[PDB]
Design a protein around this ligand. Structure first.
Ligand SMILES: CN1C(=O)C(Cc2ccc(Cl)cc2)=C(c2c[nH]c3cc(Cl)ccc23)[C@@]1(O)Cc1ccc(Cl)cc1
Length: 95
């Protein structure tokens, strides 16, 4: 899974990921990973990216999320893969 310490990592989304988060009502510039995942959840649900037949799949090929993450789809069960994709779109804030 993902260690608790790592969920609490402080991060500053780069401009395009920040715009995506703000488009679903995020207000800040600095987040924990846990908060980033919250707003991605909202984004995904709002843009209706979940596959109808296989609900664990986010089909993001035709969406900005697919451009940022660099994949046509991902499974919500693949946490480490997701954290890897997110990290490419942010800067980690020391301590
Ligand atoms: C379908 N969902 C989940 O499986 C988890 C848990 C999850 C997902 C990805 C990773 Cl890397 C880790 C954990 C969710 C949520 C994640 N955080 C939340 C907070 C609230 Cl308050 C509600 C749902 C969720 C969510 O509800 C929504 C979701 C959030 C982020 C991503 Cl990338 C995909 C889906």
């Amino acid at each position: 899974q993902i260690p608790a310490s790592e969920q609490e990592t402080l991060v500053r989304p780069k401009p395009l990921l920040l715009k995506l988060l703000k488009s679903v009502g995020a207000q800040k510039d600095t987040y924990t990973m846990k908060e980033v995942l919250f707003y991605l959840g909202q984004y995904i649900m709002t843009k209706r990216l979940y596959d109808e037949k296989q609900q664990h799949i986010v089909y993001c090929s035709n969406d900005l999320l697919g451009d940022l993450f660099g994949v046509p789809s991902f499974s919500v069960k693949e946490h480490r893969k997701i954290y890897t994709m997110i990290y490419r779109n942010l800067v980690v804030v020391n301590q």
